[PDB]
Design a protein around this ligand. Structure first.
Ligand SMILES: NC(=O)c1ccc[n+]([C@@H]2O[C@H](COP(=O)([O-])OP(=O)(O)OC[C@H]3O[C@@H](n4cnc5c(N)ncnc54)[C@H](O)[C@@H]3O)[C@@H](O)[C@H]2O)c1
Ligand SMILES: NC(=O)c1ccc[n+]([C@@H]2O[C@H](COP(=O)([O-])OP(=O)(O)OC[C@H]3O[C@@H](n4cnc5c(N)ncnc54)[C@H](O)[C@@H]3O)[C@@H](O)[C@H]2O)c1
Ligand SMILES: CC(=O)N[C@H]1[C@@H](OP(=O)(O)OP(=O)(O)OC[C@H]2O[C@@H](n3ccc(=O)[nH]c3=O)[C@H](O)[C@@H]2O)O[C@H](CO)[C@H](O)[C@@H]1O
Ligand SMILES: CC(=O)N[C@H]1[C@@H](OP(=O)(O)OP(=O)(O)OC[C@H]2O[C@@H](n3ccc(=O)[nH]c3=O)[C@H](O)[C@@H]2O)O[C@H](CO)[C@H](O)[C@@H]1O
Lengths: 310, 312
């Protein structure tokens, strides 16, 4: 297939590019380097089936880009990704996650694109849900601007689906980790932990350390993108995770055990916008797509730590 | 109380400003005249309880405006309102209806505002639900960017409620009609019909003319805004309509009757983004706010046509 990946210079995005290339597709990567890193893509310099486009989804001429490359599928991973930043600047977050998505769909509907695979946020869109693990049938209840924009994004794409028959599916991961996740970001705990501990620098958890997340390995998430790019799950969201909850303190202990060295994080004040718990029901992805997570946390932590050790 | 009304130079907004003033509130109106009209507010020139601010909600310093005026409640009616226009330019519609709303909420949470009463669209957000009349518990399913943005605005306001305890309620009207509705607008069938029939110009319905809407009179809608402005129905949407369906064809007949003369519309092809059917369940508003609509279509159409006469 002809694929286009927005946010391609990012953690998940660069990994997806790799997987799509390996499966024998041509890939157009698109990014503006807001949080992406050229270093994530530098191995592709002489890769025959990849071409990169530096563009801002909020302001670039996406029509011309899509008209030129005619991707069959757009994998849409470009977004403002930090919950806390979305709180500090809800307008910027909305501009990138809502307006960017709208412009993309509007360009896609006019350029014969078959399907947009959207990245929603399984971890956050449900807010505090009625039950854990949480199914896609649970109502959305965002409690950060980030979460709200992701929901809005789904709704808009569903709308384009009604209007024009531009197909869409919403990949909704929990907390994704693995190699290439920015260790210098303020989001991406596993990478933040791994880098700091490897270099003997201080680490922290927030509040009392009891917050849980559902940690799912990047390679697993990428396979879900691939499966859903076919003619399946039109207008549907797919929770992508493990159905297992790990505390911040438990996560720290696991990363410190892989790195060797101390397990003594500082405890800092709670962060406005951060949910206390997240656990995803992944039954729908198993039945419809045949998707199941292969990498357990202990294994994922080792792979991530060994990527940072070098 | 101190109130601020965005979209204040518009059809519903100017009417709301009138009601709030009559209730003894001080009122700041705000508008950029994208679709509004100076004539809608011209009578308020000498009223010291009303201040008007020309501002674009997309780019204006809403923080500074709200810091100056310190409204207790913000009634948010400023929006791109045309479904067809939202299809032609979804980006522009999203900027006004989503970004604009976010900017207002971010300003309101910093300036001691108690509550934002949002204007959603009961008419469009549900899409093709299995239930008519449609209750608020029915899942949203927008089929136009206008409707998507209205839903998106609800959600953002709900988010701000969680984050900061900035209270919100969403007034979700059906098809609103009455005095001050722009006769030369792209949207607003009652006004479109009255102006064309009163000056013997052509008129049209879309498709086979069987599309239905739930026509609710502006005064009834404005009353709901007032009731929901209090510390009640926090976080909730309220459908505001009559729970009765009228087809495009039947409405034409009703306006033709009120005007006099011929009942002979043209039939034009369906418009992309338009729902075929709309009717709201208004039970929640009755139970929670004590709100019921007073004006039946026949009475309301006569009132509207009267207004259009006095305006030569
Ligand atoms: N990491 C997780 O746990 C997780 C899980 C659920 C949702 N997501 C979503 O997955 C996607 C990938 O995020 P990630 O974890 O790889 O983080 P990331 O920051 O590494 O990737 C985001 C990428 O988007 C790019 N981008 C941002 N704004 C842009 C714009 N206006 N124009 C063009 N490119 C722009 C960034 O430069 C970056 O390359 C995002 O949409 C994110 O919201 C992440
Ligand atoms: N009329 C209906 O049948 C109906 C029913 C449901 C929802 N609504 C909603 O009710 C509200 C009022 O609509 P109306 O029927 O009075 O239409 P209107 O066009 O007369 O009123 C909308 C007002 O918003 C102003 N506005 C638009 N964009 C703005 C911006 N960027 N900055 C500042 N002001 C801006 C316009 O200039 C206008 O005065 C809107 O939010 C609309 O979507 C209308
Ligand atoms: C539950 C939730 O909303 N998850 C979403 C959110 O992840 P999060 O915002 O939850 O991710 P994060 O890496 O910022 O934090 C994850 C967890 O690790 C903890 N932590 C983090 C950093 C640190 O130095 N120490 C520490 O203890 C933090 O308290 C939290 O419980 O945003 C992601 C994109 O960025 C995805 O959209 C996730 O689905
Ligand atoms: C069902 C629905 O989505 N309703 C919303 C939508 O109203 P609408 O977009 O339905 O408003 P409109 O006045 O444009 O159309 C109302 C009805 O009148 C018909 N018609 C219109 C023009 C004409 O010349 N002849 C004719 O017959 C049209 O086919 C439709 O069935 O937008 C409004 C704001 O603008 C409100 O948000 C409404 O809640």
């Amino acid at each position: 297939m002809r694929a286009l990946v927005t946010g391609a210079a990012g953690f998940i995005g660069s990994t997806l590019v790799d997987r799509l290339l390996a499966d024998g597709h041509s890939v157009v990567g698109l990014d503006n380097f807001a949080t992406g890193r050229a270093t994530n893509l530098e191995h592709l310099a002489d890769n025959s089936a990849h071409v990169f486009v530096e563009a801002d989804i909020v302001t670039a001429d996406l029509h011309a880009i899509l008209e030129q490359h005619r991707p069959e599928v757009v994998f849409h991973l470009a977004a403002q990704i930090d919950v806390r930043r979305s709180v500090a600047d809800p307008q910027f977050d909305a501009a990138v996650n809502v307006i960017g998505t709208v412009r993309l769909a509007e360009a896609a509907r006019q350029t014969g694109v078959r399907k947009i695979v959207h990245t929603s946020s399984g971890g956050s869109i449900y807010g505090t849900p009625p039950e854990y693990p949480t199914p896609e049938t649970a109502p959305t209840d965002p409690a950060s601007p980030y979460a709200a924009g992701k929901v809005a994004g789904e709704i808009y794409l569903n709308t384009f689906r009604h209007l024009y028959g531009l197909d869409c599916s919403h990949i909704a991961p929990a907390n994704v980790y693995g190699p290439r996740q920015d260790p210098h970001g303020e989001a991406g705990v596993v990478a933040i932990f791994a880098q700091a501990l490897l270099s003997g620098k201080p680490t922290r958890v927030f509040g009392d350390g009891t917050n849980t997340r559902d940690y799912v390995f990047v390679d697993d998430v990428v396979d879900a993108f691939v499966r859903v790019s076919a003619d399946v799950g039109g207008g549907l969201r797919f929770n992508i995770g493990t159905g297992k909850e790990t505390s911040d303190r438990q996560l720290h202990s696991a990363v410190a055990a892989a790195v060797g060295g101390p397990d003594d994080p500082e405890f800092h004040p709670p962060r406005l916008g951060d949910l206390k718990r997240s656990c995803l029901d992944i039954g729908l992805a198993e039945r419809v797509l045949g998707w199941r997570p292969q990498i357990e946390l202990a294994d994922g932590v080792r792979r991530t730590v060994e990527y940072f050790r070098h």
